[PDB]
Structure 1
Amino acid sequence: ESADLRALAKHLYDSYIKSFPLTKAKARAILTGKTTDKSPFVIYDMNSLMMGEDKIKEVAIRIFQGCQFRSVEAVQEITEYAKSIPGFVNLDLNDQVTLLKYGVHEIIYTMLASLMNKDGVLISEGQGFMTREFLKSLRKPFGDFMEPKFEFAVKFNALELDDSDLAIFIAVIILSGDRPGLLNVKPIEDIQDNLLQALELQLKLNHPESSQLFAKLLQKMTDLRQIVTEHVQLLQVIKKTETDMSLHPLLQEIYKDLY
């Protein structure tokens, strides 16, 4: 049993490396300045935003549109990673779509934390760094969009997960049997139960001194759902007070009848 759970963990890590160009290991090196690559361009005010718009009409709207296109790319990367989880492509296609529709924003926020520190977030494949204070400086309601993600990220990053832990954590979230409208829950729960046993063993071996880390990650799964619920609400305000504000077609499809 345990040897097979390590082979599953390794498969997921290898698939995560294939699916996600900017890993946590690569992001932390950039953020702490321990890489040979050119330093990211720092965006901390409007003048620096203008200067760096090329290395990466109203400003808050332009930032929100770039957020959308990055989110679309992330949905596609997350979908390829999901298709690498053993058993996932043999699920009913309706259920694959439902798991991704309800799971991809929880995964986006998990993986965004890998690009964040308390002072800002890496953007454009690590070629830019936007400060948390600058995001706070945007006019309402856009100035509150990112702050809940930074708050989540600071506490999540304190758990010191690596990419090998994250690969299994993300798979567990995708294979959630309680999403609304799933047609065949038992095969999903069977895959998830095996992923949960792999995650427990991964954290016992990789974080032997981190007591109750598994329970803490289960609770982060709950927290991520609440984050996403709150995010969906903020978006419902954008469409009732902001014009020139239409979501990309892939995001429209995901958000339609979402929560």
Structure 2
Amino acid sequence: ESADLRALAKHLYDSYIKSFPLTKAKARAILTGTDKSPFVIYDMNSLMMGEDKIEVAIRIFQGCQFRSVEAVQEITEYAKSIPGFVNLDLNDQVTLLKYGVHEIIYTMLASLMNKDGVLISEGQGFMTREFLKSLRKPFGDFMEPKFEFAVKFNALELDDSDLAIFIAVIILSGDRPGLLNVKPIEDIQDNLLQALELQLKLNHPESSQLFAKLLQKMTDLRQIVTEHVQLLQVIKKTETDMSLHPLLQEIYK
């Protein structure tokens, strides 16, 4: 019944606001500004001005590494609020997070992107696309495909209350490898999808088949993950002196 699906949409949006400090609504108010504009990093010595105000490639790398660990933590916190998730088998909870976390991270990374760059340091800074692309060897190809995804994903014009449900749909997948009790996962996702469908029709009545278009976007996410794991493997063997944070490599197996 629609009333129960509305209250579940309200619950998830509420918990999303509580778990994710930098929302898309805030991200967009910073990107389209004049209260607190970001400091813009576009070359090497602007990057070096970027702590008088808020190698280089390695520096950026470990900066993203720190933020991803922080994102995993926020995502993990959000997961526990999805009704039914903490009642699943422990191994399955772990499995849903291990595989869901980077697809969520690229989804929400789009919230901080326009075609020209990405918000960093809680929105305090803005790093340009072209500067990320000019990085040496393998580092300069990490962010470009996420920019590509974001440009297209942001075309859907989703807002945070949309994203809160869609992110929950991602986590409760059920075709993740190694799941022990697929079926109670699928019964939750099914209710989520019902919530997402009603949420999209009410929030975007003019937007024909946004539900279908949003779900098709889940193949775009799966592909970014794969590219990324390959690039991460090239680096593990090029700079044997540099370490992936244990939360992150645990996820990567």
TM-score range, shorter chain: over 0.9
Question: For the Cα contact (< 8 Å) 1:55–1:127, is it kept in 2?
Answer: no
Identify unmatched segments of 5+ residues in structure 2.
none
**Alpha-carbon spacing, 1:20–1:172, altered in 2? closer, same or farther (3 Å):** same
- Aligned partner of residue 90 in structure 1, secondary structure: coil
- Aligned partner of residue 83 in structure 2, secondary structure: coil
The structural deviation recorded for 1:55 is 3.9
The structural deviation recorded for 1:192 is 0.1
RMSD: 0.9
Q: Distance in 2 between matches of 1:53 and 1:214?
A: 42
Partner of residue 217, structure 2:
220
What TM-score do you get using the length of structure 1 for normalisation?
Answer: 0.96
**Alpha-carbon spacing, 1:129–1:194, altered in 2? closer, same or farther (3 Å):** same
The structural deviation recorded for 1:243 is 2.6
Question: For the Cα contact (< 8 Å) 1:83–1:89, is it kept in 2?
Answer: yes
Which ranges of 4 or more aligned residues in structure 1 deviate by more than 4 Å? none
Counterpart among 89, 112, 117 of residue 114 in structure 2: 117
Deviations 1:104-146 (A, max 9, x none): 0000000000000000100010000000011011101100000
The structural deviation recorded for 1:37 is 3.6
Deviations 1:147-170 (A, max 9, x none): 000000000001000000000000
Q: Distance in 2 between matches of 1:134 and 1:150?
A: 13
Q: Distance in 2 between matches of 1:54 and 1:199?
A: 44
The structural deviation recorded for 1:249 is 1.2
What TM-score do you get using the length of structure 2 for normalisation?
Answer: 0.98
The structural deviation recorded for 1:244 is 2.3
Identify unmatched segments of 5+ residues in structure 1.
none
Question: For the Cα contact (< 8 Å) 2:39–2:53, is it kept in 1?
Answer: yes
Question: For the Cα contact (< 8 Å) 1:25–1:163, is it kept in 2?
Answer: yes
Q: Distance in 2 between matches of 1:202 and 1:62?
A: 41
The structural deviation recorded for 1:221 is 1.0
Question: For the Cα contact (< 8 Å) 2:27–2:112, is it kept in 1?
Answer: yes
The structural deviation recorded for 1:81 is 0.4
Q: Distance in 1 between matches of 2:129 and 2:175?
A: 34
- Stretch deviating more after TM superposition (139-148 or 226-235): 226-235
Q: Distance in 2 between matches of 1:49 and 1:152?
A: 25
Deviations 1:163-204 (A, max 9, x none): 000000000000000001111100000000000011011111
Q: Distance in 2 between matches of 1:234 and 1:176?
A: 25
Partner of residue 19, structure 1:
19
Structure 1 position 72 matched with structure 2 position 87: no
- Aligned partner of residue 89 in structure 1, secondary structure: coil
The structural deviation recorded for 1:54 is 4.7
- Stretch deviating more after TM superposition (37-46 or 87-96): 37-46
Q: Distance in 1 between matches of 2:81 and 2:29?
A: 27
Q: Distance in 1 between matches of 2:14 and 2:157?
A: 20
Percent identity reads: 100
Q: Distance in 1 between matches of 2:176 and 2:231?
A: 21
